[PDB]
Amino acid sequence: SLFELGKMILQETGKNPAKSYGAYGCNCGVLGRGKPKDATDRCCYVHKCCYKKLTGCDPKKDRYSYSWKDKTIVCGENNPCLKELCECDKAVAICLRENLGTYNKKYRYHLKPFCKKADPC
Amino acid sequence: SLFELGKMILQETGKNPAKSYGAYGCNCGVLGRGKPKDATDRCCYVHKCCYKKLTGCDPKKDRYSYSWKDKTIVCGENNPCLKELCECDKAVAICLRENLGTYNKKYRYHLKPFCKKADPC
Ligand SMILES: Cc1c(C)c2c(c(C)c1O)CC[C@](C)(CCC[C@@H](C)CCC[C@@H](C)CCCC(C)C)O2
Ligand SMILES: Cc1c(C)c2c(c(C)c1O)CC[C@](C)(CCC[C@@H](C)CCC[C@@H](C)CCCC(C)C)O2
């Protein structure tokens, strides 16, 4: 759920999840996807597409278990959807971290409207 | 949906929705409710409870139409859930605007652990 997602982002990026990624670009935050503004945003884009593949679980509300082992997010077995979900979240946190270098605060509270329609996943 | 909600909030408050309300207090933006920290936060609490009352539609995903008439958000739905949904949104947008006077930036990104259990809707 958003709690694990937030925590992962926090863990990987060291940044307050909500502040930095709760609303960034066309893809990080609420409101589906949009043409990504940058790498960071693309992480969220990929992340939302990742969520699209899920079936059987609520990416937002369903909590799941994962562990921080050797400073790596390790998804708990949970169940297939939750594990996949967890993997989606883990991927985006990793991705956001990898792209922290080009994080651009100007995209922080980007207005969802000024986002080009995203390509289908 | 959040698209209309966000637009309403911007329209009423004149503030970037994600920036001011994406994560404010215990109820604005954050997942779930919490004892409101203040009036602004209470708006979101009320809004979330309003959402809980809806039966035939998805408050997050379902789009509905509304118009801006005489600088008033005018829901344009007859479907009861979409109408109610729209009204929930309109109400929080108005409420957020009516409470900008006690809006406090220190509640932005308020840490969930500080939130006390919300009263039941
Ligand atoms: C409706 C909706 C929202 C609002 C949303 C997303 C999706 C898919 C949705 O359908 C995806 C990403 C994000 C951008 C989430 C980003 C951050 C949050 C999950 C914050 C979690 C915060 C907690 C744990 C701890 C970290 C903060 C430290 C200060 C302790 O917000
Ligand atoms: C899951 C969930 C979320 C995430 C939520 C709330 C509730 C009740 C929920 O159950 C209430 C308020 C808020 C904090 C509001 C956040 C605002 C976003 C909806 C904004 C998107 C803003 C865009 C469109 C505005 C610009 C458009 C122009 C056309 C005017 O977020």
Question: What does this molecule look like?
Answer:
2 copies of one chain form a homodimer. Chain A is mainly alpha-helical. Chain A has a single domain (1-121), classed as Phospholipase A2. Chain A is 42% helix and 7% strand. The radius of gyration of chain A is 13 Å and the shape is globular. One vitamin E sits between chains B (2-3, 5-7, 9-10, 17-18, 21-22, 28-29, 44, 47-48, 51, 60) and A (30-31, 111-113).
Topology:
The structure is a homodimer of 121-residue chains.
Chain A: H1 2-13, H2 17-21, H3 39-53, E1 66-69, E2 72-75, H4 80-98
Antiparallel strand pairs in A: 1-2
Helix pairs in contact in A: 1-4, 3-4
The structure holds vitamin E (2 copies).
One vitamin E sits between chains B (2-3, 5-7, 9-10, 17-18, 21-22, 28-29, 44, 47-48, 51, 60) and A (30-31, 111-113).
Keywords (chains A, B): Antibiotic, Antimicrobial, Disulfide bond, Heparin-binding, Myotoxin, Secreted, Signal, Toxin
Subunit structure (chains A, B): Homodimer; non-covalently linked (probable alternative/compact dimer conformation in solution). Binds to heparin.
Pfam family, one (chains A, B): Phospholip_A2_1
What is the gist of this entry?
2 copies of one chain form a homodimer. Helix content of chain A is 42%, strand content 7%.
Q: Number of helical runs of chain A? A: 4
How much of the sequence of chain A is in beta strands?
5-15%
Please list the strands of the largest sheet of chain A in the order they lie side by side.
Answer: 1-2
Number of separate domains of chain A: 1
Site (Cationic membrane-docking site (MDoS)) (chains A, B): 112, 117
Main location (chains A, B): secreted
Region (Important for membrane-damaging activities in eukaryotes and bacteria) (chains A, B): 105-117
InterPro entries (chains A, B): PLipase_A2, PLipase_A2_Asp_AS, PLipase_A2_dom, PLipase_A2_dom_sf, PLipase_A2_His_AS
